[PDB]
A = this chain, B = another copy of it.
Amino acid sequence: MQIFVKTLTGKTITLEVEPSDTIENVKAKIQDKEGIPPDQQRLIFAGKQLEDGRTLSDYNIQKESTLHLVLRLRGG
């Protein structure tokens, strides 16, 4: 299925995912598509910071849901 990911510049990308994808899977797909290291990605859905071991379905992410991607440097 397709989901959308929205950045702070307004840009929106489409990703191919399954409900069983974990957040780490999604970050890996953003790496593949956009070249962003997973450690520089912060994903948000429904006002929650998304955790690497939980699935899209755990957060109620569905076909055509929109996540937010914020880039950060590693805190250290």
Residues of A in contact, count (CB < 8 Å): 10
Please provide the chain A residues from 25 to 76 with a CB less than 8 Å away from any CB of chain B in the complex.
39, 64, 66, 68, 74, 76
Instruction: Give the oligomeric copy count.
Output: 2
B66 touches A12 (CB 8 A): no
Chain B residues near A39 (CB-CB < 8 A): 64
A12 is contacted by which of B6, B10, B76 (Cβ under 8 Å)?
Answer: B76
Query: Which residues on A are within 8 Å of B, measured CB to CB?
Result: 4, 6, 10, 12, 39, 64, 66, 68, 74, 76
A and B contact pairs by CB, cutoff 8 A, 10 listed:
A4-B74, A4-B76, A6-B76, A10-B76, A12-B74, A12-B76, A39-B64, A66-B74, A66-B76, A68-B76
